[PDB]
Design a protein around this ligand. Sequence first.
Ligand SMILES: CC(C)(COP(=O)(O)OP(=O)(O)OC[C@H]1O[C@@H](n2cnc3c(N)ncnc32)[C@H](O)[C@@H]1OP(=O)(O)O)[C@@H](O)C(=O)NCCC(=O)NCCS
Length: 161
Amino acid sequence: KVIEFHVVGNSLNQKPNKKILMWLVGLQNVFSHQLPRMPKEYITRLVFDPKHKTLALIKDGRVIGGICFRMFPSQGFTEIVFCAVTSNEQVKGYGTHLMNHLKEYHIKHDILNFLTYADEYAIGYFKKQGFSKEIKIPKTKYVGYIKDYEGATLMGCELNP
Ligand SMILES: CC(C)(COP(=O)(O)OP(=O)(O)OC[C@H]1O[C@@H](n2cnc3c(N)ncnc32)[C@H](O)[C@@H]1OP(=O)(O)O)[C@@H](O)C(=O)NCCC(=O)NCCS
């Protein structure tokens, strides 16, 4: 019925809010069920990590999808950690809106590069979102504090104006 996008996080500043707190758990839940190769404890570890933020897709007050990301302003890129939409809401374009919305959010902050390690079943999604295996960014800029998930295919995406 009603759709909303909210960028949330556990920032050590001021976010112990109950509304966003329940959303973070809802995000952990959806990520955990949709991303089996990511242990649930690990997902909880990063989703609540102050350096990470998550773009949440809320529908009728409940989280049905989101994208956890870790921005690296200095190195001019953002790491896309988790992406998922609940099973019952998939194949409706929401995954598309999320990536699109997240792109604009980054063009706004002057970050025009997306780097992620796509999983076997993810490759198709990122491809349809404009990501490509051919990295348009030097390794010296990302290879360092960007987790390289075993069995994953490193992919990138450069944003528009
Ligand atoms: C990948 C995911 C987040 C997005 O799914 P979604 O909300 O259903 O995506 P969309 O409906 O916006 O996809 C639309 C387009 O993506 C394509 N696509 C490719 N891979 C896809 C996949 N795994 N699921 C759904 N669509 C997919 C569709 O064919 C479609 O092409 P079209 O617009 O020309 O018809 C969701 O399928 C999911 O939760 N997957 C399980 C976890 C996962 O594999 N995550 C990868 C990290 S994002």
